[PDB]
Amino acid sequence: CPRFLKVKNWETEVVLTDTLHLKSTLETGCTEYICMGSIMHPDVATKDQLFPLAKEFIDQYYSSIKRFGSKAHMERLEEVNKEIDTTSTYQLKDTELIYGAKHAWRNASRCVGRIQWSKLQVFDARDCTTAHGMFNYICNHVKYATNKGNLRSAITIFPQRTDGKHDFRVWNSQLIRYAGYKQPDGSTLGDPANVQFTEICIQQGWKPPRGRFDVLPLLLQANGNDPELFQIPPELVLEVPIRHPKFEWFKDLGLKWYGLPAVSNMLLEIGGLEFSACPFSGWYMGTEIGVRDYCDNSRYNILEEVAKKMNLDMRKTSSLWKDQALVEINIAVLYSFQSDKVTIVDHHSATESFIKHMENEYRCRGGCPADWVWIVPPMSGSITPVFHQEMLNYRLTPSFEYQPDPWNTHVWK
Amino acid sequence: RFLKVKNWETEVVLTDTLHLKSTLETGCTEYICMGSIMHPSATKDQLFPLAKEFIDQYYSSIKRFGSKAHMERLEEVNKEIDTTSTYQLKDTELIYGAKHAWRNASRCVGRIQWSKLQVFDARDCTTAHGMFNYICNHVKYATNKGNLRSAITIFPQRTDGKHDFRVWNSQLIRYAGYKQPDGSTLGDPANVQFTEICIQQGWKPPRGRFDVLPLLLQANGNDPELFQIPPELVLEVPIRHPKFEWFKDLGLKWYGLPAVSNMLLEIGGLEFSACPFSGWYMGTEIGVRDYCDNSRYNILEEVAKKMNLDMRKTSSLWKDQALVEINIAVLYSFQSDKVTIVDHHSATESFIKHMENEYRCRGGCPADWVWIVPPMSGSITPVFHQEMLNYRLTPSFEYQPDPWNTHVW
Ligand code: HEM
Ligand code: HEM
Ligand SMILES: CNCCCc1cncc(CCc2cc(C)cc(N)n2)c1
Ligand SMILES: CNCCCc1cncc(CCc2cc(C)cc(N)n2)c1
Ligand SMILES: C[C@H](O)[C@H](O)[C@H]1CNc2nc(N)[nH]c(=O)c2N1
Ligand SMILES: C[C@H](O)[C@H](O)[C@H]1CNc2nc(N)[nH]c(=O)c2N1
Ligand SMILES: [Zn+2]
């Protein structure tokens, strides 16, 4: 591979120079002959696989603290090496765990919020032994992160994978999501995307309220056991009702959303160690809710209903009636979050901050991996700065990876 | 391997086999993806196997692979390369090659139309005056009084790189750009340099906002010469709004014929360095990019003003509101003037149907998601949710160096 790669901004003419890509550790899925850049998703490590991966991470940590080649550095290496040899695995120090989480976020190419990468409260839940404990740790996460509306980003890390038969898993893909109920007539109530999972909860014993916005319970798996259900205390789930600063009729749509965006289905990889349950959260960019959750056809799909109340011409598509209702819905989303003092950021602010982050990363780190397809907002794309920014995508470690859904793999005891 | 692509909205899965036929790099490796890089990085012995491959897929596509017709054509291309270091395409081959280069154009959302393309063979052109005549005919045919028609004019292939035919204009029709004394820019800022090359060549600029640039035509590696297209061939649209009567007072117009002239058409290892091609506009090209790009006409703030919007915080989404209205006006103007235009909803729908067509009859369709998704309202068009595989099939339209960075005067 070439040593220096250039990326250009076509709006501002700025050329940046990337050396970081040389440290690339995982495969992107692309080859010289084909590009999988728009593809969403393109029994444990042996002692001989683990040695190099650990050292790689440890060297990197001691590099970051300006102690590379130090006595403490070599002692730590020997300690890890002996531990992998005696026990087939090793344990991270707390300092190492905190560094790893922050760097997994820093490396997350699909994330536009990374200017905040170094400000992450890390909760070490590695002493957790049961689902009830997982629940306690998660409720504490939610309340801390929620902070009465002034959200703070956090990750809670449960015990690492051992033999693969003893995984900790949060079965929910996000900590806070709404239920979805298929009707006999074929229509859906709630969030249609969550029907499969809503059905799983009901099977496990959940009593469904069968409403439009029912917060799903947590389905929690400790130490490879069958998962158990818990209801998050309602008072811990901050919610915002959606209203419009001009249209008085918008509140009559009976829409609201949850304040805390928290991903619980991904795998944290640090020094070759696998943290299969590592829920993390930050704060929302408006378009996530206003464009995707609300306007995707497979989601709440409210464009039609909103276009009507707006008295828009809906016969030809070239009136752009769809577009005009999209903007208003996203105005209402940002307006309702700011008025209730819940932290939210619009797609203009967020993309602008990300350009500045990316540049500083090029200046200090020699690169900043980014997935344009995820980075560009799902509306008004070219009037945000990221649209015009060339990006290099590649996969540094530590990282957040995808993993199989647990209901596909769980062995019911 | 047989690769699969999923649409996440409809859950339709398609299976791509066609990708196995490609041999040109895309720029990515297993460890670095350059999916958002705009521009990622011949003799007898080089020229033949390519000639062969192209002749082979031609006779395969007309259902006579290994025919007597096929065999002689191969021997034909043999001797011709052996003795002239090149070869000339049959007419039928030229037409097939052009249509398929459009078909293989990953970045093009309009490809449902690929097989309806009027091919003007201009290979007997020898002078810039010649080229100009050919181009005027192209523009006039393709404009067609508003009922636009896809066309391509193909000039003589490269021979030795020293006698290249080149259209210096990157597009056949574009407005001028003037670097003002006070530091502002008049017209289209994208064109400031090219405009200045024209003025330096004798062009008398009217210094207006929307001045059609003259043609700068290079024939056979010679110095280029200026030609103004006759105004009655250049169809333009005044932009007005269906509800906002003040929008006409903005003073905006755009040309009707989108016609890319800076690209290289490659067929059978032959290089057509001058091959302007045109179709018809998708509304967002003008409403979003041309008008609202910060480094282009940059009209967002002005429009938002006339809309009396609150422009103090970005979170009022005032920019978004203005953008939607600008694109409504654009569609409405063209439509009202019986000039062919397509909205990003219609065009994306057509592209998804086209994709399904391709996978069913051809086994795939290379598509560049970064280019296919419109620059506004992305996820409320179907292509946002469509996984697409990108790879490079030939015949293709490629990029080439700007001529002013290579030509020896
Ligand atoms: C602090 C405020 C943050 C903001 C505003 C933000 C912004 C975003 C946005 C808009 C997305 C796209 C999500 C989607 O389309 O589904 C995203 C994805 C993502 N974020 Fe961030 N983010 C934040 C914090 C974090 C944190 C704390 C982490 C991890 C420690 C993180 C890691 C990721 C990852 C891994 C993805 C892609 C997830 C996937 O594949 O579904 N982000 N972020
Ligand atoms: C017939 C109606 C057509 C429509 C609606 C259409 C639509 C589009 C659009 C919106 C773009 C993006 C251009 C940009 O943003 O700069 C594009 C690009 C492109 N089109 Fe099409 N197009 C059409 C016809 C054609 C024809 C006739 C050809 C060739 C014979 C062609 C080949 C290409 C190529 C090579 C690109 C990429 C240009 C570049 O790399 O800058 N298209 N098309
Ligand atoms: C995988 N596609 C489905 C996404 C559904 C979904 C539903 N609720 C919340 C999120 C959160 C995504 C998300 C995560 C984080 C950490 C920050 C942020 N701004 N956004 C995602
Ligand atoms: C390279 N990025 C800037 C392009 C600017 C530019 C200015 N005028 C016309 C075009 C042509 C774009 C274009 C080309 C074709 C063939 C069809 C279509 N609908 N649109 C492009
Ligand atoms: C097919 C395509 O990869 C898919 O729709 C992607 C496009 N870009 C995205 N970008 C973000 N932020 N989130 C998404 O879910 C997607 N989906
Ligand atoms: C950086 C990125 O490649 C560049 O901004 C691209 C993005 N997508 C595009 N898509 C289209 N249709 N036209 C363009 O000029 C661009 N520009
Ligand atoms: Zn790629």
Swiss-Prot record, chain B:
The keyword Membrane applies. GO terms for cellular component: calyx of Held; caveola; cell periphery; cytoplasm; cytoskeleton; cytosol; dendritic spine; membrane raft. Isoform 1 is ubiquitously expressed: detected in skeletal muscle and brain, also in testis, lung and kidney, and at low levels in heart, adrenal gland and retina. Not detected in the platelets. Isoform 3 is expressed only in testis. Isoform 4 is detected in testis, skeletal muscle, lung, and kidney, at low levels in the brain, but not in the heart and adrenal gland. Heme b binds at residues 108, 399. Disulfide bonds: none annotated. L-arginine binds at residues 171, 280-281, 285. It is found in: Cell membrane, Sarcolemma; Cell projection, Dendritic spine. One of its GO terms (molecular function) is arginine binding. Ubiquitinated; mediated by STUB1/CHIP in the presence of Hsp70 and Hsp40 (in vitro). (6R)-L-erythro-5,6,7,8-tetrahydrobiopterin binds at residues 36, 370-371, 384. Keywords: Calmodulin-binding, Cell membrane, Cell projection, FAD, Flavoprotein, FMN, Heme, Iron, Membrane, Metal-binding, NADP, Oxidoreductase, Phosphoprotein, Synapse, Ubl conjugation. Produces nitric oxide (NO) which is a messenger molecule with diverse functions throughout the body. In the brain and peripheral nervous system, NO displays many properties of a neurotransmitter. Probably has nitrosylase activity and mediates cysteine S-nitrosylation of cytoplasmic target proteins such SRR. This is Nitric oxide synthase 1. The chain holds residues 304 to 721 of 1434 of the full protein.
